[PDB]
From Swiss-Prot, chain A:
<comment type="subunit">
    <text>Binds to host ACE2. RBD also interacts with the N-linked glycan on 'Asn-90' of ACE2. Cleavage of S generates a polybasic C-terminal sequence on S1 that binds to host Neuropilin-1 (NRP1) and Neuropilin-2 (NRP2) receptors. Interacts with host integrin alpha-5/beta-1 (ITGA5:ITGB1) and with ACE2 in complex with integrin alpha-5/beta-1 (ITGA5:ITGB1). May interact via cytoplasmic c-terminus with M protein. May interact (via N-terminus) with host bilirubin and biliverdin, thereby preventing antibody binding to the SARS-CoV-2 spike NTD via an allosteric mechanism.</text>
</comment>
<feature type="glycosylation site" description="N-linked (GlcNAc...) (complex) asparagine; by host">
    <location>
        <position position="62"/>
    </location>
</feature>
<feature type="region of interest" description="Disordered">
    <location>
        <begin position="42"/>
        <end position="61"/>
    </location>
</feature>
<feature type="disulfide bond">
    <location>
        <begin position="31"/>
        <end position="63"/>
    </location>
</feature>
<protein>
    <recommendedName>
        <fullName>Spike protein S1</fullName>
    </recommendedName>
</protein>
<feature type="region of interest" description="Disordered">
    <location>
        <begin position="70"/>
        <end position="82"/>
    </location>
</feature>
<comment type="function">
    <text>Attaches the virion to the cell membrane by interacting with host receptor, initiating the infection. The major receptor is host ACE2. When S2/S2' has been cleaved, binding to the receptor triggers direct fusion at the cell membrane. When S2/S2' has not been cleaved, binding to the receptor results in internalization of the virus by endocytosis using host TFRC and GRM2 and leading to fusion of the virion membrane with the host endosomal membrane. Alternatively, may use NRP1/NRP2 and integrin as entry receptors.</text>
</comment>
<feature type="glycosylation site" description="N-linked (GlcNAc...) (complex) asparagine; by host">
    <location>
        <position position="46"/>
    </location>
</feature>
<feature type="glycosylation site" description="N-linked (GlcNAc...) (hybrid) asparagine; by host">
    <location>
        <position position="22"/>
    </location>
</feature>
Length: 97, 49
């Protein structure tokens, strides 16, 4: 997984919130973005090393500040099968926050 | 003649929630022959000053 889009019309008319997670970083950003771009993704097993990604944002506008910090995702070593982690998230809005 | 930066949203469909702004224009009508033209009559333009 990588990020969530929050907005009213998913366009650059208003400030729409986006999240971008690096392998060792997270970026949480609200600004006016018109349409997220998806890079070329047709590769399953030949490309074991995952690279040539990111650059998914749109044209810049009147942007606020980001929250570059340590990522929250933690992975444990999968040993002897069926060892995976379930991640839970809740988003809400009380008095704008 | 004023600095003309007195833009107030006049009317819109939704009463605003606390600490909420709308960076948008509208062609508010109140409903008859749904219109999006710049004409003042029955296609009333908010954001006066």
């Amino acid at each position: 997984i990588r990020g969530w889009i929050f907005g009213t019309t998913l366009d650059s008319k208003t400030q729409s919130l986006l999240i971008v997670n690096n392998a060792t970083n997270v970026v949480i950003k609200v600004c006016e973005f018109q349409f997220c771009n998806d890079p070329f993704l047709d590769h399953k097993n030949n490309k074991s090393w995952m690279e040539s990604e990111f650059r998914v944002y749109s044209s810049a506008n009147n942007c606020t500040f980001e929250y570059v910090s340590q990522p929250f995702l933690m992975d444990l070593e999968g040993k002897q099968g069926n060892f995976k982690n379930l991640r839970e998230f809740v988003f809400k809005n009380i008095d704008g926050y | 003649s004023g600095n003309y930066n007195y833009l107030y949203r006049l009317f819109r469909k939704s009463n605003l929630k606390p600490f909420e702004r709308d960076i948008s224009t509208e062609i508010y009508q109140a409903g008859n022959k749904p219109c999006n033209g710049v004409a003042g009559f029955n296609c009333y333009f908010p954001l006066r000053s």
